[PDB]
């Protein structure tokens, strides 16, 4: 009844947060990229290693948010909204 809009709203809000998370990872990546007026040798090696890892884990986090968006996020709320229109 009134549950439906409240569900749609909440699923949208989670969906916005998932997207802001994604945006934040990218921004963080750009801040890290510009810190590269700095390193050389084994600290750059440590930095490159740490970077490669951070890229790797991001892909993981984006993969996980794809799953959540389908279940309770932006896709989920879109589905419910259109479903309520159909019915």
């Amino acid at each position: 009844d009134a549950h439906i809009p409240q569900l749609i709203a909440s699923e949208a809000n989670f969906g916005a947060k998932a997207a802001l998370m994604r945006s934040t990872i990218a921004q963080a990546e750009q801040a890290a990229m510009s810190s590269q007026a700095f390193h050389m040798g084994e600290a750059s090696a440590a930095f490159q290693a740490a970077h490669a890892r951070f890229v790797e884990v991001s892909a993981k986090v984006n993969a996980l948010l794809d799953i959540a968006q389908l279940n309770i996020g932006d896709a989920a709320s879109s589905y419910v909204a259109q479903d309520a229109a159909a019915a």
Binding site: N13, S34, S35, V57, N71, I72
Partner: protein
Amino acid sequence: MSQIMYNYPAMLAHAAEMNTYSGALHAVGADIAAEQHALASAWQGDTGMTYQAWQAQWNQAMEELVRAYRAMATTHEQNTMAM
């Protein structure tokens, strides 16, 4: 002279900025986790992944993202104070 002493103010400011992103990533991740819990009963076996399984994988991945990011931050600070 030192070139590390010459750029100290900006390298420090830049450390401050990177660390700001550690905090933002932690916070946004915690919210996402709380909200995913709040919405548990809306979650179905769509992927075949339960909500409990996702919660756990989310927190694990987030803890790993922040540490990976903090490793880079530390690599920077090491120069700023190498001086």
